[PDB]
């Protein structure tokens, strides 16, 4: 039974023999390397007294993926100061009041706040919403907008479901199949965006008129991952059609950066809402696939496992996600090896560090029993 029910979170590092003191130290150190004055590893930058952002180092921009991640990290770490800095920057610079995506958040901005696009990225929105609910529950709603966290969350999820009913906009979920979309104007998806464990919580906390929908989306997403993951290797494509098969029209049909998150998501869903035979077997497949492969040699792979010449752009993120997946198969043949590999992998430095280090901190939180549900 999941932590949602027991309110006890598995400390998998501890269960696998790491000391409580060393785990505590490693979690704090990871946070400090990302959010403190450690220029080589840092991804969070403070602006003035009331702003802050996470920098996508690989593209020199600020993304809703990163900002929503940073808010989730901040609430998990009980850092309202950092949470509010990031959320303030997000509302000031990213929230759109004009155009077909009014009510959503521009997916990419320059560090100065200028929007690079008026298109949103749904995986940002869903992380903003849950981070905001958690903020409301840990700290209480603030008296001034936009710090009325729970209202902001419910408003945002309203738009995600209902956009287009009163205007030219489009929803971020397909209303018929209850699946999250890659972007509002397309009819295909991205397996890594599927967060059934978030949707379960939305089914308790969103506007009441959408609570049944959110339960249905949770179930739809669990079913969708079964068809999207390769049956032998467990590998999911970056983009996939609603039928579960890869969308490779622009090269996103393979196992690469986006896909890494699928294992992590399965891990966290198992911890929060309970294990399943499917999830255990799926993590066992991915870990089996990587068992005989060196991190230095990790590639892009077709989902059937065929390797490309191209190396993984984010091999540390791949390590972190595979290790976080162990929460879904704690007795799995490779579960300990994956957790140990992660323990022995430092936080990343250099221009490509942002994505790896985000996945890294999520894995550190989850594997130490510190990626929690914050209830009202
Ligand atoms: Ni120590």
Q: Say if CB 220 and CB 228 are below 8 A apart.
A: no
Q: Say if CB 146 and CB 91 are below 8 A apart.
A: yes
32 CA → ligand 1 middle, Å: 15
23 CA → ligand 1 middle, Å: 8
Separation in Å, CA 344 to CA 26, 34, 265, 319:
11, 18, 22, 10
Q: What is the DSSP string of 223-284?
A: HHHHHHS-TTT----SSB-TTSSB--TTS-SSBSGGGHHHHHHHHHHHHHH---HHHHHHHH
25 CA → ligand 1 middle, Å: 6
Q: How far apart are CA 209 and CA 225, in angstroms?
A: 26
Q: Domains of the chain, with CATH numbers?
A: 1-369 (1.50.10.10)
275 CA → ligand 1 middle, Å: 32
Q: Say if CB 236 and CB 230 are below 8 A apart.
A: yes
346 CA → ligand 1 middle, Å: 15
Which residues, in sequence order, are bridge partners of residue 173? 180
24 CA → ligand 1 middle, Å: 9
Q: How far apart are CA 338 and CA 346, in angstroms?
A: 14
Q: How far apart are CA 226 and CA 284, in angstroms?
A: 14
Q: Is 131 left (phi over 0), alpha (psi -120 to 50) or beta?
A: alpha
* Preceding omega of 146 cis (within 30 degrees of 0): yes
Q: How far apart are CA 302 and CA 1, in angstroms?
A: 34
CB atoms closer than 10 angstroms to residue 315:
20
**Can you say whether the dihedral through the CA atoms of 257, 262, 265, 270 is positive or negative?**
negative
Q: Say if CB 248 and CB 230 are below 8 A apart.
A: no
Q: Say if CB 325 and CB 338 are below 8 A apart.
A: yes
CB atoms closer than 10 angstroms to residue 59:
14
With residue 45 as reference, give the H or E element that holds it: strand 44-47
347 CA → ligand 1 middle, Å: 16
Report the candidate in 23, 134, 67 with the shortest Cα–Cα distance to residue 367: 23
Residues with CB under 5 A from ligand 1 (ion): 25
Q: How far apart are CA 45 and CA 10, in angstroms?
A: 31
Q: How far apart are CA 358 and CA 355, in angstroms?
A: 5
215 CA → ligand 1 middle, Å: 43
Which are the contacts of 347, defined by CB distance < 8 A and separation ≥ 6?
30, 33, 34, 41, 316, 353, 356, 357, 360
Interrupted after residues, the chain (C–N over 2.5 Å): none
């Amino acid at each position: 039974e999941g932590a949602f029910y027991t309110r006890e979170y598995r400390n998998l590092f501890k269960e696998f023999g790491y000391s409580e003191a060393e785990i505590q130290e490693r979690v704090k150190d990871t946070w400090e390397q990302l959010f403190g004055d450690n220029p080589e590893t840092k991804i969070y930058y403070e602006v003035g007294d009331d702003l802050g952002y996470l920098l996508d180092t690989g593209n020199l921009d600020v993304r809703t993926e990163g900002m929503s991640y940073g808010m989730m990290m901040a609430v998990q770490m009980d850092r309202k100061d950092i949470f509010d800095r990031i959320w303030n920057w997000t509302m000031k610079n990213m929230y759109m009041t004009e155009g077909v995506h009014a009510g959503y958040f521009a997916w990419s901005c320059q560090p100065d706040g200028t929007k690079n696009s008026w298109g949103p990225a749904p995986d940002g929105e869903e992380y903003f919403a849950l981070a905001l609910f958690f903020a409301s529950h840990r700290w209480g709603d603030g008296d001034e907008q936009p710090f009325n966290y729970s209202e902001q969350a419910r408003k945002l999820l309203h738009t995600c479901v209902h956009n287009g009913e009163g205007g030219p906009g489009h929803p971020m979920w397909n209303r018929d199949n209850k699946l999250i979309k890659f972007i509002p104007e397309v009819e295909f998806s991205d397996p890594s965006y599927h967060l059934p464990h978030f949707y379960e919580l939305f089914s308790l906390w969103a506007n009441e008129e959408d609570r049944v929908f959110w339960k249905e989306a949770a179930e739809a997403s669990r079913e969708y991952l079964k068809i999207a993951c390769h049956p032998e290797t467990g590998l999911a494509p970056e983009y996939a059609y609603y039928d579960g098969t890869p969308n490779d029209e622009k090269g996103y049909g393979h196992f690469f950066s986006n896909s890494y998150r699928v294992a992590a998501n399965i891990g966290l869903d198992a911890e929060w809402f309970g294990g399943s035979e499917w999830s255990a077997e799926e993590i066992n497949k991915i870990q089996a696939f990587f068992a005989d492969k060196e991190p230095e040699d990790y590639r892009r792979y077709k989902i059937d496992g065929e390797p490309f010449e191209e190396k993984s752009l984010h091999p540390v993120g791949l390590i972190a996600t595979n290790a976080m997946g162990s929460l879904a198969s704690v007795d799995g043949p490779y579960a300990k090896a994956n957790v140990d590999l992660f323990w022995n992998t430092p936080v990343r430095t250099g221009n490509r560090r942002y994505y790896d280090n985000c996945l890294y901190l999520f894995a550190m939180l989850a594997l130490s029993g510190n990626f929690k549900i914050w209830f009202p």
